[PDB]
Amino acid sequence: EIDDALYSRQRYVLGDTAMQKMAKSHVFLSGMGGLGLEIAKNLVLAGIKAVTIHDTEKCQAWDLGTNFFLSEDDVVNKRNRAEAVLKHIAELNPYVHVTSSSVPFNETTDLSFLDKYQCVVLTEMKLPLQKKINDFCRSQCPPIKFISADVHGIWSRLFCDFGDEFEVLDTTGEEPKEIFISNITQANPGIVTCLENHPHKLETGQFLTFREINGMTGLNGSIQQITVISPFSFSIGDTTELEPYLHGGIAVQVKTPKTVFFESLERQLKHPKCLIVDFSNPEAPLEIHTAMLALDQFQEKYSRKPNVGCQQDSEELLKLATSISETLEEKPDVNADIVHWLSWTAQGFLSPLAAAVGGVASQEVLKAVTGKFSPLCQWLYLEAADIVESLGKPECEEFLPRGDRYDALRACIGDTLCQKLQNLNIFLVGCGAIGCEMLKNFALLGVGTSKEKGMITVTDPDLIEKSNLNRQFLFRPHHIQKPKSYTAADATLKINSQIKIDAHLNKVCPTTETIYNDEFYTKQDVIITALDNVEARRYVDSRCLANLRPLLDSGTMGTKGHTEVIVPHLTESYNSHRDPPEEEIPFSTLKSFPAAIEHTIQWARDKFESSFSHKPSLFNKFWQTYSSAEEVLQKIQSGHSLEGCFQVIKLLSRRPRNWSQCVELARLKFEKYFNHKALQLLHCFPLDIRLKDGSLFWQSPKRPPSPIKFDLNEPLHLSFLQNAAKLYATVYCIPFAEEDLSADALLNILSEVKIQEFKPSNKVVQTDETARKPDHVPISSEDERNAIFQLEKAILSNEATKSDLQMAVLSFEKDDDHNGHIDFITAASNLRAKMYSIEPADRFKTKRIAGKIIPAIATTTATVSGLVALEMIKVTGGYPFEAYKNCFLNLAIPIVVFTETTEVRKTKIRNGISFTIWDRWTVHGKEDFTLLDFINAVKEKYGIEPTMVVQGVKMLYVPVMPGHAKRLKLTMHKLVKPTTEKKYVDLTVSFAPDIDGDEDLPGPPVRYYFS
Ligand SMILES: O=P(O)(O)O[C@H]1[C@H](OP(=O)(O)O)[C@@H](OP(=O)(O)O)[C@H](OP(=O)(O)O)[C@@H](OP(=O)(O)O)[C@H]1OP(=O)(O)O
């Protein structure tokens, strides 16, 4: 099977079929350089059955700056690189059988041994050898998937070749869409109309299936190719021979296999299918490909890479590139700058770019071994020329190696920028999947390793769980239930002994703002967020905007990822970007009229919360507010009203006393949820009732419920009964054993249970989507008397003791599979689904939807971490606006889009006065300084007269209010009454617009000093 506790988050990304295909697959990886190590790490974290790492190079001091598993002892002993890293790699995932190899590769090497590997990845291999290996691999039956990846300084090359014909079983991996049908016309071709404000969002040529269609019963169960006509309509083909449309209908998107044609590596070198990553330079990938091919030819010709600063070598490389360009089909122009920089940084190696390319290549390997997504076709050329482009023309002496571990990075970015990196003060927020990779990149780049000023602060309150080991490679199984930051710091210190780190456990929130005051942010140079929610992102961005400090943001949703770069005085902040809010499920839809499995899952989750967390909390709070039941009864008899008293009384009268009573209560709850509710709803609205227009009320998207008869033999009913009984026993503190969960024991208990007869009641049911949950309806006197009688009976029965007035409150924990929370939610959701004839969902989908688990995989995390590290380098260098690039990537397509970061927008108020979001105004005063003096000072310093003073919720001054015109004479200390904690106070000021009737135009925040 599949270890769900470890692969829970990856299971949603890939699927159990892809997971089973990931086993039984043997992957051969060669080179074990900086890039090969990243690829191997990502693959082992993914969970491939067996990986064979192979290398022949001996470890060197230069390798320490690129390999995060090597140590100085390995260099001393001159061990093989694969042998040295084999022990560490295997510990990442014990399920993976990792083996090392050292068989030499050359012209005469026999390639017969590669037939046992599904996929082959080659790094740091000579080009003719790659050609021969690819030719052998693609000619096998079945073809062996070939992937080649290389990194030379700041330039990278990625290649894929999955045989002549590769069968993709899933083009995108998105959830199939469901489109509700409004009306279908009998025509050749017929036209299908969707419901209003429900765009189908479909593409011409896709195949759809139909069900629950009245009139055209033939269309049910059939598959038709469609042509898009309008956002709410499309054509499916001839429908004249069918019966006229009545009502109803659901169309479901159908996924089909797709065939992708690749080509041999030898032929691809002349007509490359490069993937465009920057639409502003569509022809850049072709030029980069030409330059790298010229570099390979230079290596073949001279047996060495070009020397940095040797003009003759650069001229020779340019000549070779010019010669190569003519042989290309398109004959593109040779980019002198790209060739020159490739010559300059040929011998270097950039760690973040290596990590990004490793993530992409690992995703491609997974595509090769599973067919889950559309593979790359065929070349991907990532580059980081922006890092050195802003440097202009530096001297060669800044790039010469100096013997330390940072020679690889120095040969790329020069000594000056390396020194600037070592003195950074980085405040890294959150230490999740992205945080660990960012720490690894920091250790590789030497960030904060200086003994003078460098310092890294990482803060995180969570604890390590088993499911986190799949993505966060810095953690180990023995680290479970330990702080994330401490473990990450301990591991990073192992990676680079010189690094300075300072872990924290505080959660970044306004409650902890005292620790992370303004001075602390002033000390920091770069702030990086690895958060998973939105509110924390907005809070951190607001703090950074207040303190004028650059912020880097990133996030991953499965194969999707995005990076955002925020720079003071240059780019818009995160708060300036506002997405539409979350999709609120209508209250009427959730409560009474579900239409999809998501609605039932949400209803089950809310029912669980209300039954086991909210209601017990109310019960405990009520019984702690008052002494005992006698006092409450006396108050009620005197006419006193208490909040939620009747509900508490009802709960007390139904408290189970033993396991049998708990089972009976679960049975009654089942009957109420899935038998009485449907009958009540049908009684309120019969199946054949119609509206004023004559249309059936029970039409799409509403679905008519049907009662469910209890049956212990049904596995679903038994599962629900068991889970409900266990949860109720836990809440009411009733001991039980597994024998009590047996079907026979439950049947014996249920033999004596009498089922109360259902009786319909007159209740108002909200049907409009705009309706929401109303407040508490006042309770009639008869219900009050019933509650009084029940409470008196409980008191007289001596069942109101202290033990009876307390009951434990459960917390919804989803990762713990033995508590039965997810089992109960799944049982309730499926049972409700059968009530409304909705398709049931399995346990894992319910766990994902109810728990709001965000799918995530290691490869996307590594890629976004590498890109964020590149942007951090750019920020540290203080480069101009054009250098920074926001990134959005979706490896499922695959697609990578680099775009310029959003330019800061200037907002004008009056007389040409303009301000940015980064601007903050300062005012100084004294004790007798009045509001009129404040207005005069503002109009003097900035030329604009204030007309609106706000401090949060405080209403300070408006000239138009009838009675507050006198406030101009009031001093600040009396107008706002500020706290004495600080010497200044922040205010929000607006000015009257040039056109009357409009609200005063808000201005930049203004900080007023009391002295
Ligand atoms: O408190 P809620 O989570 O909103 O659930 C309540 C509650 O049902 P449970 O106690 O079974 O969870 C009501 O029962 P009381 O505790 O008030 O007796 C029940 O009312 P009825 O038993 O009278 O049907 C009502 O259902 P409704 O609003 O349809 O009357 C139902 O609400 P939901 O199940 O829709 O949440």
Ligand SMILES: Nc1ncnc2c1ncn2[C@@H]1O[C@H](COP(=O)(O)OP(=O)(O)OP(=O)(O)O)[C@@H](O)[C@H]1O
């Ligand atoms: N306000 C905050 N301050 C500090 N750390 C935060 C804050 N909000 C979230 N975090 C951290 O963000 C991290 C997010 O990590 P990640 O995205 O890998 O998921 P996770 O929390 O480990 O779990 P899962 O992926 O299962 O939801 C968590 O470790 C959490 O501690």
